């Protein structure tokens, strides 16, 4: 996260770290959506242009974390993966359309002050909140700058951007399964996701019921925190039927 700040303790108790076993390193962010299911970006698991194709046994899920590198004894919980499900129409070839994946844990994780699931939006909450100017919050342990690394989880609040501005910022074909967020050059404030934040959540706090909803998944950008560029996020509600199909089936 570029131009963010240290998270408060327990601020994002749904935040998950995807951790590579060998070599031991941060792979991506992710989020906890129930005691057995974790949501992330498909490109965290499958991205052939970078020779990325992880299997269940390559990875661990670390939940309840704050420190990036420390083993947070008695706080974090480490889970193994039972199964990965990648969206069948995930478009890694072109533009990362439908950049979404689910991971089922081998065993349920116990909730605590530091571990708690985020809500997924329904149509109404999405309609109300996914509007240009409305701000969400992005969290992760990725790089502090495009070209270093944080001691603890970082957080930044960013406004959703009008779709024409998103489109006009890039040569990539944007789809309805994406939205973009970030400040414009003239707005002064800044901030963005960056390498390592992939797969983490873009959340909004509903003013109707005071619950946090995951509206987006950190997907792609052009550099990090560049003037005139924006971060692009998977539109979770637009892909919720798939999410529900997977959870209902498996």
């Amino acid at each position: 996260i570029v131009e963010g700040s240290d998270a408060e303790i327990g601020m994002s108790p749904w935040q998950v770290m995807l951790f590579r076993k060998s070599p031991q390193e941060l792979l991506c962010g992710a989020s906890l959506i129930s005691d057995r299911w974790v949501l992330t970006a498909a490109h965290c698991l499958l991205y052939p242009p970078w020779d990325k194709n992880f299997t269940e046994n390559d990875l661990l899920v670390r939940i309840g974390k704050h420190s990036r590198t420390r083993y947070e004894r008695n706080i974090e919980k480490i889970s193994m993966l039972e199964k990965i499900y990648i969206h069948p129409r995930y478009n890694w070839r072109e533009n990362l359309d439908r950049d979404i994946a689910l991971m089922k844990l081998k065993k349920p994780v116990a909730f605590s002050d530091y571990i708690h699931p985020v809500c997924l939006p329904d149509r109404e909450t999405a309609a109300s909140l996914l509007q240009a100017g409305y701000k969400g919050r992005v969290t992760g342990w990725g790089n502090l700058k495009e070209t270093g690394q944080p001691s603890v989880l970082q957080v930044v609040n960013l406004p959703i951007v009008e779709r024409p501005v998103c489109k006009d910022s890039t040569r990539i074909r944007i789809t309805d399964n994406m939205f973009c967020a970030g400040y414009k050059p003239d707005e002064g404030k800044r901030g963005d996701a960056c390498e390592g934040d992939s797969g983490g959540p873009f959340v909004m706090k509903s003013p109707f019921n005071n619950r946090w909803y995951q509206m987006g998944i950190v997907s792609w950008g052009e550099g990090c925190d560049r003037d005139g560029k924006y971060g692009f996020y998977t539109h979770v509600f637009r892909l919720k039927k798939w999410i529900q199909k997977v959870i209902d089936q498996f």
Binding site: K21, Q24, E25, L26, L60, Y71, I78, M80, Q149
Partner: peptide, 10 residues
């Protein structure tokens, strides 16, 4: 740069 995690998690 990462602190070792318990062996049980393999």
């Amino acid at each position: 740069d990462f602190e070792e995690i318990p062996e049980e998690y393999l």
